[PDB]
């Protein structure tokens, strides 16, 4: 398999079964037995929150540049008023995040336990692997089932698109901190003068 560094030995824990495995654990953050089960679940929420993050940071800002949404910038979106209080929407989120993540917390701890419904137990999730809750609510098209070689490719495509979005969202964060311009305008200021709009010029 290809690795993150040619001529470097792959670690004994990353053996190449996991989708997206390029032997990249230089600091040994997943060495310990039982630890790599937690770090895949951590990678999967972070990659999917970043692909949700990149679709809310770049896509409404790109369509603002075209001018068919007129949405405000994401770093000034916390100052925008809504039908609810901005402080109130935090706690309503973390009451709903208290439900959705603790159902996810029990799946990492005890797999195959919380696939059944808390209310109407005929509705059961069809997901078998940890971190892939297949069911009508999450995978209505049934794209998460098939051959293991076919399933590994689409799980490789989640995390390779997911690691790009993590780098993307981490980039927009630092761009809005030192330049105070939204990141689609940072792209359009880089296609005009690329050698004068660089991280050293923005300090």
């Amino acid at each position: 398999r290809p690795l993150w560094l040619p001529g470097s030995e792959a670690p004994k824990w990353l053996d190449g079964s996991l989708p997206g495995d390029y032997g990249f654990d230089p600091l040994d953050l997943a060495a310990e037995p039982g630890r790599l089960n937690w770090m895949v679940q951590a990678e999967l929420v972070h990659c999917r929150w970043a692909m949700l993050g990149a679709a809310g940071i770049f896509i409404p800002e790109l369509l603002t540049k075209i001018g068919i949404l007129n949405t405000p910038s994401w770093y000034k979106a916390g100052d925008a008023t809504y039908f609810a209080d901005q402080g109130t929407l935090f706690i309503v989120e973390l009451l709903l995040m208290a439900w959705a993540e603790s159902r996810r917390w029990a799946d990492i701890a005890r797999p195959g336990s919380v696939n059944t419904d808390p209310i109407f137990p005929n509705n059961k999730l069809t997901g078998t692997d940890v971190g892939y809750p297949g069911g009508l609510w999450f995978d209505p098209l049934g794209w998460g089932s098939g051959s293991e070689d076919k399933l590994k490719e689409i799980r490789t495509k989640e995390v390779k698109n997911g690691r790009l979005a993590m780098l993307a969202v981490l980039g927009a964060f630092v761009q809005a901190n030192v330049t105070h311009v939204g990141p689609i305008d940072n792209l359009f200021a880089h296609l005009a003068d690329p050698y004068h709009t660089t991280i050293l010029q923005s300090l």
């Binding site: 230089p26 600091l27 040994d28 953050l29 310990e32 039982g34 630890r35």
Partner: protein, 160 residues
Amino acid sequence: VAGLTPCKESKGFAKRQKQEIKKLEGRLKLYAPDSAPALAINATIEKTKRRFEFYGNQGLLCGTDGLPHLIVDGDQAHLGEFVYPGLVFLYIAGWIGWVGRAYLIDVRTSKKPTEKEIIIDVPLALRIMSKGLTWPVAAIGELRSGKLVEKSSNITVSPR
């Protein structure tokens, strides 16, 4: 906060800027204006004026002495006085504590463990000094897995 005026509007803090340049300007009066020691005092004045314009722009609190005071309680205005450089420090200090702890584990399973502390194995040292970058994820990871602490049955204890 705590009876302290901000340093940008403190009359005592502006008085200390006035009497510091005036001390350095009187030092400049006995030198030629293009001389080499006069360039050092001219660089000292610009270092002083950079310092006073930096302290007032960070929201520092100045007392009745005209001196910037640090609020270390954890105020949302005052994070860079104690909380922000404290978290910067503890990351660096935990980096020192994690690569010195991981070096001792790496040399305890060696042929002569005491010759690797007077003569520090630099390829063994430098391969874990890079690994001390991500140390809160490795210290609490060893704490949760039980590898951080040693059980008291295997610890040398002085008798009662």
